[PDB]
Design a protein around this ligand. Sequence first.
Ligand SMILES: O=C(c1c(F)cccc1F)N1CCCCCC1
Ligand SMILES: [Cl-]
Ligand SMILES: [Zn+2]
Ligand SMILES: [Zn+2]
Length: 574
Amino acid sequence: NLDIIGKRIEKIKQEHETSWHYDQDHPYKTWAYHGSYETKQASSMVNGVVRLLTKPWDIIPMVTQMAMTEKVDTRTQEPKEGTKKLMKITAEWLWKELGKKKTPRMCTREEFTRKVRSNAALGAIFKWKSAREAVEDSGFWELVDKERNLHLEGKCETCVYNMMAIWYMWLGARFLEFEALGFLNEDHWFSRENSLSGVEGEGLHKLGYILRDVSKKEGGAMYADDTAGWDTRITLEDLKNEEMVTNHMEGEHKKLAEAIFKLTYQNKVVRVQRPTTVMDIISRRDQRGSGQVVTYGLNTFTNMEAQLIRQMEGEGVFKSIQHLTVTEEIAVKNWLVRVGRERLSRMAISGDDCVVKPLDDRFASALTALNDMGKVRKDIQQWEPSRGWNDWTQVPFCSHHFHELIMKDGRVLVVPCRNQDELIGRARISQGAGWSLRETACLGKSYAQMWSLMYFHRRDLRLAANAICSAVPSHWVPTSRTATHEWMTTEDMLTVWNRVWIQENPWMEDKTPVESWEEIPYLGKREDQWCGSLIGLTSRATWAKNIQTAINQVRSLIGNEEYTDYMPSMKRFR
Ligand SMILES: O=C(c1c(F)cccc1F)N1CCCCCC1
Ligand SMILES: [Cl-]
Ligand SMILES: [Zn+2]
Ligand SMILES: [Zn+2]
């Protein structure tokens, strides 16, 4: 406890000795409170380029409301000795499997610096006002070694979280986390090839094909249960099992990673703004509070573990979570060695998001381990059996569903989809300040090229994407201040479409290139409507007919630049 968090608490208390006070009206019941001190200190801005080219959606509240505008302070009971054993055995088998074809290794100042000099979201907090300033100041790199040497010495002074669910930290604490645990993401530990259940690096154009491949397996319904507040249900045992990745390390690396887990993850210090505006200094040992990138890989690991145990429960590998007989301990082991790899292949897991095709439907009511691990399902009663999906094209995953779409030439595309109001509403929103008109235009172009590559099958989005690309100067480079983003390019979008959907698509045997957009199909007209199309409305007809007037409005605002007309790529403007 304070033998681990005190130096951080002491350092903060002194920097605010003038305002230090043990407030008696602290609202915390699960988070340990330490003290308070004095301070005084983020809306979604509209993208004008996208909004002027999507006029019909100006009167659709599901779009327009997206731009406008309790669980962390809860506890998670300790699992039962049978649960804690199932988790330990499974977590041991899983780190060994993930480690068979990979080597844990430290990530480098050079690698960190290259990532900061390319605008990667490292959940950092404002000596220097930009990350680039710190990584360009041998004084910034002088602070790390002190704490780095403190970590090698098993102590921590400056690794404190700022709650804003994103727990930000000083760039130096982020570096130390990246050096020790960045290898999980940088070396693709959760790739489907290495993890079997994972989809890290896959891309939205691959996820539907992956779910269709899971659907091919013999077995029961496809289950896609969401957890209620996954990051808040992470137990101190879960952290212990995640920490076992250090059993595969050596030297400096082993000690640097052991310190991240012990000092930052299993014993956190957090700063939180309370309007009553003060700063509260609180501590808790459980729950997830690491960096987003590390959070993703450890959530994927612990979710893979939890779903294999739910599969074992459905198959009768054990009978009760109270106590695991030494015999069962050997049955659980022999199950993992004999069929563990096959079982991981029956799943698609992206952090807290899973799809599972179990051996049969006993899985639906196999709930004792899942509830006792604290991974309580959302929107269902605790012993109410799960609702499965009978058709892979109906399963939700990574905020999408997937359509099977047949090209006029017979070839099969499996495409990503979601309600079109969500897509249009998100493209109309920008985050941050000081956006020039050029920077706003280039963010609109990023959305447009994403729509051309992923959502070409939606009539409204192919038309709006063509309009935005016509309205923004042809050589201006797509930008985003904040999968695999193949749309982030100035290459011709037909050439990129061919590369992604034909040349590099391992599910497409015939590699004949597509010569024009007119060849590339849409959903059926009624399916497009079901998924939120405005086709058939008078507002949409007037927009499509008059689109050149909308394009010319935006071109007149941007000014006298070089533009290309992409509308004749469509059938109706040709
Ligand atoms: O009015 C329609 C229409 C229709 F006639 C039948 C079914 C669904 C529809 F949306 N369409 C005009 C808008 C552009 C492309 C879709 C066709
Ligand atoms: Cl279904
Ligand atoms: Zn530290
Ligand atoms: Zn759809």
